[PDB]
Design an enzyme around this catalytic site. Structure first.
Site, PDB file in Angstrom:
ATOM      1  N   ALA A  12      -1.442 -15.274   6.408  1.00 28.85           N
ATOM      2  CA  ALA A  12      -0.974 -15.970   5.201  1.00 28.85           C
ATOM      3  C   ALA A  12      -1.794 -15.619   3.976  1.00 28.85           C
ATOM      4  O   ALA A  12      -1.242 -15.234   2.950  1.00 28.85           O
ATOM      5  CB  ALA A  12      -0.999 -17.471   5.412  1.00 28.85           C
ATOM      6  N   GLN A  15      -1.440 -11.787   3.174  1.00 31.62           N
ATOM      7  CA  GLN A  15      -0.125 -11.496   2.596  1.00 31.62           C
ATOM      8  C   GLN A  15       0.049 -12.089   1.195  1.00 31.62           C
ATOM      9  O   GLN A  15       0.684 -11.474   0.342  1.00 31.62           O
ATOM     10  CB  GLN A  15       1.005 -11.911   3.556  1.00 31.62           C
ATOM     11  N   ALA A  99      -6.973 -15.437  16.944  1.00 31.13           N
ATOM     12  CA  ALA A  99      -7.356 -16.781  17.368  1.00 31.13           C
ATOM     13  C   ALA A  99      -6.207 -17.546  18.007  1.00 31.13           C
ATOM     14  O   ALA A  99      -6.382 -18.695  18.409  1.00 31.13           O
ATOM     15  CB  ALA A  99      -7.907 -17.558  16.182  1.00 31.13           C
ATOM     16  N   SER A 140      -3.931 -20.238   5.591  1.00 32.47           N
ATOM     17  CA  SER A 140      -2.946 -21.176   6.120  1.00 32.47           C
ATOM     18  C   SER A 140      -3.658 -22.297   6.855  1.00 32.47           C
ATOM     19  O   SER A 140      -4.706 -22.079   7.459  1.00 32.47           O
ATOM     20  CB  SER A 140      -1.970 -20.470   7.067  1.00 32.47           C
ATOM     21  N   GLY A 143      -2.503 -21.475  11.163  1.00 31.40           N
ATOM     22  CA  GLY A 143      -3.061 -20.417  12.006  1.00 31.40           C
ATOM     23  C   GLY A 143      -4.432 -20.706  12.601  1.00 31.40           C
ATOM     24  O   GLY A 143      -5.157 -21.577  12.126  1.00 31.40           O
ATOM     25  N   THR A 145      -6.990 -18.357  12.895  1.00 29.64           N
ATOM     26  CA  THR A 145      -7.927 -17.747  11.955  1.00 29.64           C
ATOM     27  C   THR A 145      -7.924 -18.519  10.637  1.00 29.64           C
ATOM     28  O   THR A 145      -8.983 -18.906  10.131  1.00 29.64           O
ATOM     29  CB  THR A 145      -7.549 -16.277  11.682  1.00 29.64           C
ATOM     30  N   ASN A 206       5.071 -24.917   2.419  1.00 27.02           N
ATOM     31  CA  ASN A 206       6.044 -23.857   2.657  1.00 27.02           C
ATOM     32  C   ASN A 206       7.488 -24.347   2.526  1.00 27.02           C
ATOM     33  O   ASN A 206       8.332 -23.608   2.018  1.00 27.02           O
ATOM     34  CB  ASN A 206       5.814 -23.168   4.020  1.00 27.02           C
ATOM     35  N   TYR A 224       8.839 -14.281   3.975  1.00 26.67           N
ATOM     36  CA  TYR A 224       7.467 -14.437   3.479  1.00 26.67           C
ATOM     37  C   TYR A 224       7.240 -13.708   2.156  1.00 26.67           C
ATOM     38  O   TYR A 224       6.499 -14.191   1.301  1.00 26.67           O
ATOM     39  CB  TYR A 224       6.445 -13.923   4.497  1.00 26.67           C
ATOM     40  N   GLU A 254     -12.765 -26.600 -16.739  1.00 24.70           N
ATOM     41  CA  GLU A 254     -12.610 -27.709 -17.670  1.00 24.70           C
ATOM     42  C   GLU A 254     -11.482 -28.629 -17.238  1.00 24.70           C
ATOM     43  O   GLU A 254     -11.596 -29.857 -17.351  1.00 24.70           O
ATOM     44  CB  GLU A 254     -12.353 -27.193 -19.085  1.00 24.70           C
TER      45      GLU A 254
HETATM   46  N1  GTP Z   1       3.645 -18.778   2.547  1.00 26.06           N
HETATM   47  C1  GTP Z   1       3.293 -18.018   3.605  1.00 26.06           C
HETATM   48  N2  GTP Z   1       2.990 -18.629   4.779  1.00 26.06           N
HETATM   49  C2  GTP Z   1       2.633 -17.885   5.854  1.00 26.06           C
HETATM   50  C3  GTP Z   1       2.584 -16.416   5.743  1.00 26.06           C
HETATM   51  N3  GTP Z   1       2.204 -15.942   6.936  1.00 26.06           N
HETATM   52  C4  GTP Z   1       2.026 -17.015   7.748  1.00 26.06           C
HETATM   53  N4  GTP Z   1       2.294 -18.166   7.106  1.00 26.06           N
HETATM   54  C5  GTP Z   1       2.175 -19.529   7.669  1.00 26.06           C
HETATM   55  O1  GTP Z   1       0.872 -19.631   8.244  1.00 26.06           O
HETATM   56  C6  GTP Z   1       0.919 -20.363   9.469  1.00 26.06           C
HETATM   57  C7  GTP Z   1       0.512 -19.455  10.619  1.00 26.06           C
HETATM   58  O2  GTP Z   1      -0.796 -18.953  10.359  1.00 26.06           O
HETATM   59  P1  GTP Z   1      -1.145 -17.404  10.095  1.00 26.06           P
HETATM   60  O3  GTP Z   1      -1.893 -17.342   8.786  1.00 26.06           O
HETATM   61  O4  GTP Z   1       0.031 -16.489  10.317  1.00 26.06           O
HETATM   62  O5  GTP Z   1      -2.115 -17.119  11.352  1.00 26.06           O
HETATM   63  P2  GTP Z   1      -3.567 -16.439  11.277  1.00 26.06           P
HETATM   64  O6  GTP Z   1      -4.361 -17.114  10.188  1.00 26.06           O
HETATM   65  O7  GTP Z   1      -3.397 -14.935  11.308  1.00 26.06           O
HETATM   66  O8  GTP Z   1      -4.213 -16.966  12.648  1.00 26.06           O
HETATM   67  P3  GTP Z   1      -4.060 -16.233  14.068  1.00 26.06           P
HETATM   68  O9  GTP Z   1      -2.969 -15.188  13.928  1.00 26.06           O
HETATM   69  O10 GTP Z   1      -3.768 -17.406  14.979  1.00 26.06           O
HETATM   70  O11 GTP Z   1      -5.428 -15.631  14.240  1.00 26.06           O
HETATM   71  C8  GTP Z   1       2.338 -20.869   9.583  1.00 26.06           C
HETATM   72  O12 GTP Z   1       2.395 -22.168   8.986  1.00 26.06           O
HETATM   73  C9  GTP Z   1       3.145 -19.885   8.776  1.00 26.06           C
HETATM   74  O13 GTP Z   1       4.322 -20.502   8.259  1.00 26.06           O
HETATM   75  C10 GTP Z   1       2.928 -15.833   4.431  1.00 26.06           C
HETATM   76  O14 GTP Z   1       2.908 -14.600   4.250  1.00 26.06           O
HETATM   77  N5  GTP Z   1       3.263 -16.679   3.446  1.00 26.06           N
HETATM   78 MG    MG Z   2     -15.237 -27.473 -25.448  1.00 28.56          MG
END
Ligand code: GTP
Ligand code: MG
Ligand code: GDP
Ligand code: 96C
Ligand code: CA
Ligand code: CA
Ligand code: MG
Lengths: 440, 424
Positions: A12, A15, A99, A140, A143, A145, A206, A224, A254
């Site tokens: 997330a 990206q 993770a 995010s 996830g 991570t 989201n 996404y 500020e």
């Molecule tokens: N807005 C948005 N949400 C995202 C995107 N990719 C993943 N998500 C959201 O993030 C969450 C999943 O976490 P991720 O960030 O894909 O997972 P990660 O941080 O890579 O963690 P692991 O893969 O488990 O190591 C879900 O709620 C998804 O809907 C993105 O490109 N944009």
């Molecule tokens: Mg000032």
């Protein structure tokens, strides 16, 4: 100086960073290879865009940023894609195994193997800085991570950088886009363990970004790429104050003085306008009065809640483009009478205004129409506690049966950490309730 | 006693200060690079009050520029009269003060304060007979409010027998940067009560209303607010800067204007109000300068009583008609001047008028109505403080809640003290 280092953690974050940094390059006239024709000071400079970009002697403008993910697939697309030349290879950091939607694996098991390397790579960016202001963390809630590794990182940055400011752009989960069953667990776990260490945190629902893309851009099933390109405009509106010169430009710190009345109450509601398709925007110019009025239409919020059934502690309006004080003042006066804006009895009821002249750009072949003016409202409303409520209920339904808790206990966590986190969230909901109550 | 040393602190401080120097340099015929290109000998006869004479007969201001971030002082250097200020007297930090008193007074500003005082000493050492200091600043922000009041305490320690004036831009929600201003203002007011002999209360509420209502500016900038301030600032300092016979110093003013030491908060006025073709008759200037509409501190002078007044008419006019007119408003509204201080209105005339106008009038009033301004900030303070709102910004810099409760109480005593003599 006043440099700002961006950290993008997990898919997330990564990206959204691609979106954000693509957009910043188009706003500053930076090319994909890193060259800035308009930049005459070769090698260095004290310009406003230098808060986000350092310069090499060859003239490459390089993002002050780190991309971390525990698996390579998502960062590998940056490494081979359009902006591969923009980043030094050591700003892009990967492991081999992720993770797995587990805060425990992101925070402890897989996470402890790469944390030192990341802090070492953040430190190399920090030493390029003459007057570091702080960090922006993109992740995010859902996830492994995004939740686990972020928390670990946030704790460690508090050690290495003391009280130096740390802002979050958190992606609150929703079932329309990808979700996992355990995202409420990861959400509560990271929100608890980060709350002491974050100075300000912009949540992005989201679902809210989903509904906006469907309703306003006429996109049937948004991807996404659709959501991130909208998000990055909101991210750009907030960071615009740091990246551009301006007579009537108020700095983001500020606004933060007003947005954060107590340290735990650091979650502003972002609201942006206009989000409009090229088809509808044709022969349709949206005035300052129209876009300002749209900020109070709750269908334009980054987080689903109802400010109208809550109370305001702060209202800030961050205009960019063809805007001047006069019109803004007229527009706010219109709104004050016609709309449901109640403040708490302890805050002053003014609206704080900033204006950048650099007008808002769009990504080529995007869905957003190019408009002459725009606005991002950042309010501190008690209504945002509704987001904590919806998420805390989902947590409670599973935790009542201990559903999936073994995946966390297997990786070293105790049941105590769940209840500790949940009670912190219960306190936070009660804090947002207490601030709304009238004085005696 | 001839020399005054000037200091300007923070954004507002340096912004209004710049304009003060632009205005008075023009009245003294001193061009942007520092050379004299005037005509009269009267422009140069008391030039030593605000200027040093340099090599090649250049006139450099006795002015020190202070800020905790380089933004504003960079603009002053780029601005129209930037090349006249001694570059050594630009003393700036880098990290800023975040509209935080604590940062300005206790932490960020503490780091820079010694380097400021070295330049103060540098400008003082080469003063034949230093009479006092004047500070332009705001009480709403961090640097001007916090560091300004710190410098005032340091300057008093080192020069305890000199006069300390301030031109202090008091804050207001109508023209507000941040919600924390009432905190900053209240902490500063307590400082000013102890460590200044005169404090000119410029209220932004008043300057807005004057820009909006009585100048027909729909959307006023800070520029429009600062025109009014730099005119007022030229007005009160006229009798120091020009001759003569009935000539003036700071200490005699301070003595005659301040019956009790804590009550030294003056309420400026200017007439006519500008941003014209018909010159005003003397009876109009007198009417206008005493009007509440022309006041720079948003207080109704009918709600209290004048302890002392000082009035400075500029231009070629009948000194008979000035006396007659000043005696008219005193004898026709004697309930608003305290009976127990006889002859408490002093008028002076000056032949040289300001740029644009053929004849003007600046008004300095030590009224008991000024309590209203402190009551306004005391209310704004408590609305927040009763819920400890926004305190984390200050307690993070080492401040205590006790310090807030003190500063609150000191200013509530000031308001009691002003109320005491409004009834007597
Ligand atoms: N807005 C948005 N949400 C995202 C995107 N990719 C993943 N998500 C959201 O993030 C969450 C999943 O976490 P991720 O960030 O894909 O997972 P990660 O941080 O890579 O963690 P692991 O893969 O488990 O190591 C879900 O709620 C998804 O809907 C993105 O490109 N944009
Ligand atoms: Mg000032
Ligand atoms: N009259 C006037 N007031 C100002 C100006 N700039 C800031 N202020 C006011 O001063 C307060 C903020 O202080 P500021 O000087 O910005 O902070 P500092 O630079 O840290 O001292 C607020 O009440 C503002 O309304 C100005 O140019 N003119
Ligand atoms: C309430 C009476 O107030 C007074 C009376 C006299 C003086 C005074 C005495 N000297 C030698 N000079 C002044 C004086 C008067 C001014 O008002 C016209 C001044 O302008 C502000 C002034 O400038 C420093 C000095 C003062 C107050
Ligand atoms: Ca450069
Ligand atoms: Ca320091
Ligand atoms: Mg992943």
């Amino acid at each position: 100086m006043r440099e700002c280092i961006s950290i993008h953690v997990g898919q997330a974050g990564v990206q959204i960073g691609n979106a954000c940094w693509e957009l910043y390059c188009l706003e500053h006239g930076i090319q994909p290879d890193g060259q800035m024709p308009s930049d005459k000071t070769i090698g260095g400079g004290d310009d406003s865009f230098n808060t986000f970009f350092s310069e090499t002697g060859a003239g490459k403008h390089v993002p002050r940023a780190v991309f971390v993910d525990l698996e390579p697939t998502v960062i590998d697309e940056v490494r081979t894609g359009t902006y591969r030349q923009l980043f030094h290879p050591e700003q892009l950091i990967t492991g081999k195994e992720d993770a797995a939607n587990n805060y425990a694996r992101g925070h402890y098991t897989i996470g402890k193997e790469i944390i030192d390397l990341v802090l070492d790579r953040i430190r190399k960016l920090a030493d390029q800085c003459t007057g570091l202001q702080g960090f922006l963390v993109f992740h995010s809630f859902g996830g492994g991570t995004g939740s686990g590794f972020t928390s670990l990182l946030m704790e460690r940055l508090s050690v290495d950088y003391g009280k130096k400011s740390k802002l979050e752009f958190s992606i609150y989960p929703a079932p329309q886009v990808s979700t996992a069953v355990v995202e409420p667990y990861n959400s509560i776990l990271t929100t608890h363990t980060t709350l002491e260490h974050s100075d300000c945190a912009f949540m992005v629902d989201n679902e809210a970004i989903y509904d906006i893309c469907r309703r306003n851009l006429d996109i049937e099933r948004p991807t996404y790429t659709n959501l991130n390109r909208l998000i990055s405009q909101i991210v750009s509106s907030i960071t615009a104050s740091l990246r551009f010169d301006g007579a009537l430009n108020v700095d983001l710190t500020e606004f933060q003085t007003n947005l954060v009345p107590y340290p735990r109450i650091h979650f502003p509601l972002a609201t942006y306008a206009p989000v409009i398709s090229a088809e509808k925007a044709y022969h349709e110019q949206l005035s300052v009065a129209e876009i300002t009025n749209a900020c109070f239409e709750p269908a334009n919020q980054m987080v689903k809640c109802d400010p109208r059934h809550g109370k305001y502690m702060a209202c800030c309006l961050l205009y960019r483009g063809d805007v001047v004080p006069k019109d803004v003042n007229a527009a706010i006066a219109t709104i004050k009478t016609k709309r449901s804006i109640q403040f708490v009895d302890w805050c002053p009821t003014g609206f704080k205004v900033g204006i950048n002249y650099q007008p808002p750009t769009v990504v080529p072949g995007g869905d957003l129409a190019k408009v002459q003016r725009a606005v991002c409202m950042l309010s501190n409303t008690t209504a945002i506690a509704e987001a904590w409520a919806r998420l805390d209920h989902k947590f409670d339904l599973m935790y009542a049966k201990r559903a999936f808790v073994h995946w966390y206990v297997g990786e070293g966590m105790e049941e105590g950490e769940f209840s500790e986190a949940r009670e912190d969230m219960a306190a936070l909901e009660k804090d947002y309730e207490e601030v709304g109550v009238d004085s005696v | 006693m001839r020399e005054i040393v000037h200091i300007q602190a923070g954004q507002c401080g340096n912004q209004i200060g710049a304009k003060f120097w632009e205005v008075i340099s023009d009245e003294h015929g001193i061009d942007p690079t520092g050379s004299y290109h005037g005509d009269s000998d009267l422009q140069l006869e008391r030039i030593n009050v605000y200027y040093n004479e340099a090599t090649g007969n250049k006139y450099v201001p006795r002015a020190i520029l202070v800020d905790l971030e380089p933004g504003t002082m960079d603009s002053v250097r780029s601005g129209p009269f930037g090349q006249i200020f001694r570059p050594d007297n630009f003393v700036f930090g880098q990290s800023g003060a975040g509209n935080n008193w604590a940062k300005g007074h206790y932490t960020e500003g503490a780091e820079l304060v010694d380097s400021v005082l070295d330049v103060v000493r540098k400008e003082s050492e080469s003063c034949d007979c230093l009479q006092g200091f004047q500070l332009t600043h705001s009480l709403g922000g961090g640097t001007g409010s916090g560091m300004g009041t710190l410098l005032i305490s340091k300057i008093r320690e080192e020069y305890p027998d000199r006069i300390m004036n301030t031109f202090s831009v008091v804050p207001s929600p109508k023209v507000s940067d941040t919600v924390v201003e009432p905190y900053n203002a209240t902490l500063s007011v307590h400082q000013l009560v102890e460590n200044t002999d005169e404090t000119y209360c410029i209220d932004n509420e008043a300057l807005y209303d004057i820009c909006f209502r009585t100048l027909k500016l729909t959307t006023p900038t800070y520029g429009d607010l600062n025109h009014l301030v730099s005119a007022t600032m030229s007005g009160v300092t006229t009798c120091l800067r020009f001759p003569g016979q009935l000539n003036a110093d700071l200490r005699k003013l301070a003595v005659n204007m301040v019956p009790f030491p804590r009550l030294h908060f003056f309420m400026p006025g200017f007439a006519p109000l500008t941003s014209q073709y018909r010159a005003l008759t003397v009876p109009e200037l007198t009417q206008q300068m005493f009007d509440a509409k022309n006041m720079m501190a948003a207080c109704d002078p009918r709600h209290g009583r004048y302890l002392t007044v000082a009035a400075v008419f500029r231009g070629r006019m009948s000194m008979k008609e000035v006396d007659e007119q000043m005696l008219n408003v005193q004898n026709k509204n004697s309930s608003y001047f305290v009976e127990w201080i006889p002859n408490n209105v002093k008028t002076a005339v000056c032949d040289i008028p300001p740029r644009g106008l053929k004849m003007s009038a600046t008004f300095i009033g030590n009224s008991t109505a000024i309590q209203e301004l402190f009551k306004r900030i005391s209310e704004q303070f408590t609305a927040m403080f009763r819920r400890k709102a926004f305190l984390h910004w200050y307690t993070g810099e080492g401040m205590d809640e006790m310090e807030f409760t003190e500063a609150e109480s000191n200013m509530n005593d000031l308001v009691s003290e002003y109320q005491q003599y409004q009834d007597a």
